[PDB]
Design a protein around this motif. Structure first.
Motif, PDB file in Angstrom:
ATOM      1  N   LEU A 184       0.825  -1.208   0.000  1.00  0.00           N
ATOM      2  CA  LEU A 184       0.000   0.000   0.000  1.00  0.00           C
ATOM      3  C   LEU A 184       0.855   1.253   0.000  1.00  0.00           C
ATOM      4  O   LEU A 184       0.491   2.260  -0.596  1.00  0.00           O
ATOM      5  CB  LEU A 184      -0.916   0.034   1.222  1.00  0.00           C
ATOM      6  N   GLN A 185       1.993   1.185   0.681  1.00  0.00           N
ATOM      7  CA  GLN A 185       2.924   2.306   0.733  1.00  0.00           C
ATOM      8  C   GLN A 185       3.335   2.762  -0.663  1.00  0.00           C
ATOM      9  O   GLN A 185       3.640   3.934  -0.872  1.00  0.00           O
ATOM     10  CB  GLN A 185       4.166   1.930   1.542  1.00  0.00           C
ATOM     11  N   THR A 186       3.370   1.830  -1.609  1.00  0.00           N
ATOM     12  CA  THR A 186       3.760   2.154  -2.976  1.00  0.00           C
ATOM     13  C   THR A 186       2.585   2.454  -3.911  1.00  0.00           C
ATOM     14  O   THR A 186       2.789   2.912  -5.033  1.00  0.00           O
ATOM     15  CB  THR A 186       4.617   1.037  -3.588  1.00  0.00           C
ATOM     16  N   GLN A 187       1.361   2.202  -3.453  1.00  0.00           N
ATOM     17  CA  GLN A 187       0.168   2.380  -4.293  1.00  0.00           C
ATOM     18  C   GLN A 187      -0.297   3.837  -4.375  1.00  0.00           C
ATOM     19  O   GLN A 187      -0.046   4.626  -3.463  1.00  0.00           O
ATOM     20  CB  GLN A 187      -0.986   1.498  -3.796  1.00  0.00           C
ATOM     21  N   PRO A 188      -0.987   4.194  -5.470  1.00  0.00           N
ATOM     22  CA  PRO A 188      -1.486   5.561  -5.653  1.00  0.00           C
ATOM     23  C   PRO A 188      -2.600   5.872  -4.668  1.00  0.00           C
ATOM     24  O   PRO A 188      -3.483   5.045  -4.456  1.00  0.00           O
ATOM     25  CB  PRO A 188      -2.052   5.533  -7.071  1.00  0.00           C
ATOM     26  N   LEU A 189      -2.562   7.059  -4.077  1.00  0.00           N
ATOM     27  CA  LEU A 189      -3.603   7.462  -3.148  1.00  0.00           C
ATOM     28  C   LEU A 189      -4.924   7.535  -3.898  1.00  0.00           C
ATOM     29  O   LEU A 189      -4.941   7.715  -5.111  1.00  0.00           O
ATOM     30  CB  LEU A 189      -3.261   8.816  -2.528  1.00  0.00           C
ATOM     31  N   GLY A 190      -6.030   7.384  -3.182  1.00  0.00           N
ATOM     32  CA  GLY A 190      -7.327   7.347  -3.830  1.00  0.00           C
ATOM     33  C   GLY A 190      -7.623   5.928  -4.249  1.00  0.00           C
ATOM     34  O   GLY A 190      -8.533   5.658  -5.037  1.00  0.00           O
ATOM     35  N   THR A 191      -6.819   5.015  -3.720  1.00  0.00           N
ATOM     36  CA  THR A 191      -7.053   3.596  -3.886  1.00  0.00           C
ATOM     37  C   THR A 191      -7.987   3.112  -2.791  1.00  0.00           C
ATOM     38  O   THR A 191      -7.882   3.537  -1.638  1.00  0.00           O
ATOM     39  CB  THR A 191      -5.746   2.815  -3.800  1.00  0.00           C
ATOM     40  N   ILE A 192      -8.910   2.233  -3.160  1.00  0.00           N
ATOM     41  CA  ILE A 192      -9.801   1.639  -2.182  1.00  0.00           C
ATOM     42  C   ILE A 192      -9.118   0.443  -1.558  1.00  0.00           C
ATOM     43  O   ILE A 192      -8.450  -0.322  -2.248  1.00  0.00           O
ATOM     44  CB  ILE A 192     -11.117   1.199  -2.817  1.00  0.00           C
ATOM     45  N   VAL A 193      -9.275   0.293  -0.247  1.00  0.00           N
ATOM     46  CA  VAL A 193      -8.686  -0.831   0.468  1.00  0.00           C
ATOM     47  C   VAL A 193      -9.738  -1.563   1.306  1.00  0.00           C
ATOM     48  O   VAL A 193     -10.438  -0.950   2.113  1.00  0.00           O
ATOM     49  CB  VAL A 193      -7.528  -0.368   1.386  1.00  0.00           C
TER      50      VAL A 193
END
Lengths: 194, 194
Positions: free
Chosen positions: B109-118
């Motif tokens: 998640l640290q590397t994923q684009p913000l505005g990503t649903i988790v």
DNA sequence: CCATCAAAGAGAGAAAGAG
DNA sequence: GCTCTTTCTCTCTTTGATG
């Protein structure tokens, strides 16, 4: 009567789900497990479905007053079973653990004494229905052998290419094309292929 | 990209139990779901709860007049969903199924684009209760992240060692020490440790 | 490394039994 | 005559053992 009143710590290697077998008294409850000491390992017959509290993989339990039969042991009602304190040790070296869980090699069976309890996942080559029975011819790389099971719902779906998980069968033949048969407490599960 | 009026076959993968939520307009209803095409998977906000006819795992359906947002899809009462023709394929490869349903690793998640649903089931490390929210510091083998959710009954059932299931939280901060934030359509469920 | 099995834990739908 | 709980019935997610 091999009843062992003395206790014993054991590291439970495996405990399977409880199942029903119809015998005399009516529907019976039990499951199959495998446990170990620092030295050896044994296959267990546990006749209390509710003992699944105790038998858990990697769990240590101190077992008192058990019967200890030919190729396996028996944990029953007259017995008693309890938990062990962090105090208890009983270290099972890998090779005992490893050897506990392996499916025997057919060729290894031809050399084994009859009465040897045989559990394992096998490959089904041929199968021939009988009145009350089924003849599974199972073979792996080392060779082939034959087992006579019970004829019923799921063992009916079994075909070349499926596998069967055998539990608590006995070795009724050895040497070339050894044979196992189905006992009162034997269970078999048909794993379909792919 | 944007509103899609066109017929898209998708395999329903997950669909959750409808819940209720509030806006300036007052109360609303919806449920969460996961569906997938052959190439990709999607998380769904379905605000017409009658759709629970169609949304159900393994079931292929076809949809138009829905919305496509950053990390998710919107299905309103103004779209249309339908049992797909017996001809429909939507053949979904296991790696998309496995990936559609797995809880993401924190460091991923640290590397994923913000505005990503988790969505996921996470271990609860520590909890500092606020005035309008609760700050959940969560962990796994990969690392730590903080999450600000809603402060209430079930969210306050939660203690160290318990787990929580988050659905539709959004990635707010990423990099070392990422944080996930609550939003109108998010949900949380507290699981007592042991 | 990777494929197969097995079992506990969590979640949802539908069913049966009690105010 | 009708809602509200308690089971079970099934699946999927995880994880661990096996080959």
């Amino acid at each position: 009567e091999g009843f062992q009143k003395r206790c014993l710590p054991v590291m439970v290697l495996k405990a399977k789900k409880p199942f029903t077998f119809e015998t005399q008294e009516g529907k019976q409850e039990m499951f199959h497990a495998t446990v170990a000491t620092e030295k050896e390992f044994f296959f267990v017959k546990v006749f209390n479905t509710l003992l699944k509290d105790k038998f858990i993989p990697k769990r240590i339990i101190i077992i008192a007053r058990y019967y200890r039969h030919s190729g396996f042991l028996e944990v029953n009602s007259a017995s008693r079973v309890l938990d062990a304190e962090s105090d208890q040790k009983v270290n099972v070296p890998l090779n005992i653990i490893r050897k506990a869980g392996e499916t025997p090699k057919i060729n290894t069976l031809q050399t084994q004494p009859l009465g040897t309890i045989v559990n394992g996942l096998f490959v089904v080559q041929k199968v021939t229905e009988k009145k009350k029975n089924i003849l599974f011819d199972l073979s792996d790389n080392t060779g082939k052998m034959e087992v006579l099971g019970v004829r019923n719902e799921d063992t009916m779906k079994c075909k070349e290419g499926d596998k069967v998980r055998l539990t608590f069968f006995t070795l009724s033949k050895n040497g070339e094309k050894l044979q196992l048969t189905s006992g009162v407490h034997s269970t078999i599960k048909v794993i379909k292929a792919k």
